[PDB]
Amino acid sequence: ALNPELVQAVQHVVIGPSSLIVHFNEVIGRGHFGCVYHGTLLKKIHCAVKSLNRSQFLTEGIIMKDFSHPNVLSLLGICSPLVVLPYMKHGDLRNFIRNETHNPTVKDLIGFGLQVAKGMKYLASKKFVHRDLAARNCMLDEKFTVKVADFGLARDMYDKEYYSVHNKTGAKLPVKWMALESLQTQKFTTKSDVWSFGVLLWELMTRGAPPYPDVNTFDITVYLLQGRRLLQPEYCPDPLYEVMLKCWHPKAEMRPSFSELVSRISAIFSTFI
Numbered sequence: 001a002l003n004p005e006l007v008q009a010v011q012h013v014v015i016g017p018s019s020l021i022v023h024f025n026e027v028i029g030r031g032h033f034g035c036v037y038h039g040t041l042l043k044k045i046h047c048a049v050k051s052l053n054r055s056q057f058l059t060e061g062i063i064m065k066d067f068s069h070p071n072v073l074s075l076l077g078i079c080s081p082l083v084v085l086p087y088m089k090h091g092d093l094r095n096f097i098r099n100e101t102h103n104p105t106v107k108d109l110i111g112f113g114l115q116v117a118k119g120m121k122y123l124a125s126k127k128f129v130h131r132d133l134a135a136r137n138c139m140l141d142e143k144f145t146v147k148v149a150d151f152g153l154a155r156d157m158y159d160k161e162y163y164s165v166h167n168k169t170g171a172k173l174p175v176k177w178m179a180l181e182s183l184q185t186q187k188f189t190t191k192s193d194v195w196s197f198g199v200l201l202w203e204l205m206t207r208g209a210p211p212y213p214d215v216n217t218f219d220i221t222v223y224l225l226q227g228r229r230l231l232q233p234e235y236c237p238d239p240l241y242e243v244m245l246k247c248w249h250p251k252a253e254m255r256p257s258f259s260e261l262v263s264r265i266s267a268i269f270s271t272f273i
């Protein structure tokens with residue numbers, strides 16, 4: 001009953017069950033949409049396997065297979081729908097920077113943001129809008145390479161604390177990361193991803209502080225419309241805060257592209273020893 005065209009299209013993405021061992025005995029992540037487990041891929045390859053709840057839309061998900069970039073979470077393959085992802089040793093970026101045992105420098109933190117910018121520049125060039133860019137939704141591998149994650153079949157609410165439900169609709173949205181226009185229309189664009197990226201930069205430069213702590217969530221609109229923005233973090237260089245303010249331009253079309261952001265951030269990064 002499957003579209004035969006869809007069938008032969010996904011072959012380059014399908015992983016044979018004889019080639020994947022899933023270690024269900026070790027839960028590494030619980031999500032709203034499924035659990036992540038350790039896995040072995042056949043040489044032997046260590047991976048994370050996400051097991052979704054409750055078919056054609058799953059196999060169509062292989063738009064994800066066609067995304068390949070050093071700073072974007074790759075899809076190893078698919079095989080209960082099994083999402084086979086590369087193992088990310090150092091977990092989500094927000095938890096990593098909040099970890100007191102780790103000691104990233106200012107240059108390192110700016111480096112993490114430059115990596116996210118490159119990943120988004122890639123995603124944007126494929127006309128992919130993320131809609132939930134945040135430090136909690138980026139991951140770090142064993143070489144401390146940052147991967148924009150939490151998209152496609154990997155999409156989930158990995159920290160429910162930061163999603164609030166709207167009235168007219170039912171949507172639980174990451175309001176503290178959303179652009180003004182998205183708060184008002186609930187539509188998302190690459191330029192609204194740029195707003196979120198500005199917030200992510202602030203997260204990095206505060207080592208994972210929650211944005212707008214006092215503010216009670218969906219009235220963030222009123223807060224911003226008072227003429228407000230997140231404050232400059234103590235160790236944030238002045239030009240990087242100017243970049244943040246640009247990311248939060250009132251007019252979406254006046255915000256920088258991710259291409260411009262990679263360019264500007266690479267220059268700032270380069271001034272550090």
Ligand SMILES: COc1ccc(Cc2nnc3sc(-c4cc5ccccc5[nH]4)nn23)cc1
Pocket residue numbers: 028029036048050073085086087088089091092095136137138139149150151154155158159
């Ligand atoms: C250990 O390696 C992985 C690899 C992929 C995944 C699934 C995934 N894809 N994108 C994202 S963001 C994310 C995440 C987990 C988490 C836990 C606490 C707070 C924030 C979090 N984000 N997980 N994830 C989970 C663990």
